[PDB]
Symmetry: C2
Subunit: 127 residues, 2 copies
């Protein structure tokens, strides 16, 4: 009943493989959006993406904004792929929201897909 | 219902954000330490931030706290930008949620990995 917003960039998005976790958590889809131009994006084993905020380089990464009960965040995070965390991100409009981020270590040996800016575009999994 | 969180800084017993932790339903579980894979920074000498690394890290002292699910999300909302919650490994090999720093937040900041402890760095102890 008290809620806040979460920006997801990967498999929690509509129609993708972890979206049932989002639904079961009580998540409601709010809107499509994008980060500000300060994120680099990686494909983690071509299974899910991971993004990191940087000062130079980086681009706008496509996300979905979801509304979630406060009580649901812990379990949702626990169910997430290894190396993912939740912190604060900035959107293109300048607003701040919670978002799913990757730890540095998770990107080592992985393909950077920043130039595409979107997990959907990279995988060809459109909505 | 509750979750467990490893904290390494001002949320710990007797430190400046600890009363909020207590009033939000947090209960002290135990002292612990991470596995030998964390680097630690002082962020403007106001709070610490740690990052998991393959090589070059150490055991960082933490406290394990048990807190209600919604209080966990409240911390995601209140913690300063650049801090995030993800999964960490403890010295005993187990996994627990823990507060991490994003890379960007550490840039230019003092690394205090050798000390391995916010308490040792600030000289603020609990007996």
């Amino acid at each position: 009943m008290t809620t806040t917003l979460l920006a997801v960039n990967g498999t929690l998005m509509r129609g993708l493989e972890l979206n049932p976790n989002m639904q079961k958590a009580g998540g409601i889809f709010v809107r499509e959006d994008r980060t500000d131009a300060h994120y680099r994006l990686w494909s983690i084993n071509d299974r899910h993406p991971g993004m990191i905020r940087v000062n130079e380089g980086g681009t706008h990464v496509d996300v979905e904004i979801w509304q979630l009960p406060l009580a649901s965040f812990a379990a949702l995070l626990m169910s997430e792929p290894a190396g993912l965390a939740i912190g604060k991100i900035k959107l293109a409009d300048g607003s701040e929201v919670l978002g799913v981020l990757a730890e540095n270590w998770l990107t080592e040996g992985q393909r950077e897909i920043t130039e595409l800016g979107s997990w959907r575009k990279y995988t060809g999994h459109f909505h």
